[PDB]
């Protein structure tokens, strides 16, 4: 439903709850649509997340 394709992860931060959030480039959406998402929202994006974490 509110689920979209991830093009890439661009940055990360820890919020106030100590949860990692990731700055997402959404495939097919322009850079003004980028959003910070908590780690759980990346359930469908295992490969790009692990690449981001290892780099």
């Amino acid at each position: 439903a509110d689920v979209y394709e991830v093009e890439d992860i661009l940055a990360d931060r820890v919020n106030k709850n100590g949860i990692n959030e990731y700055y997402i480039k959404w495939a097919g959406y322009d850079w003004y649509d980028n959003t910070w998402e908590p780690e759980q929202n990346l359930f469908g994006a295992e490969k790009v997340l692990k690449k981001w974490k290892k780099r």
Binding site: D2, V3, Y4, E5, V6, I24, W26, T35, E37, N41, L42, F43, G44, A45, E46, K47, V48
Partner: peptide
């Protein structure tokens, strides 16, 4: 194909 929930 990578998917995620967008707030």
């Amino acid at each position: 194909k990578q998917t995620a929930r967008k707030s």
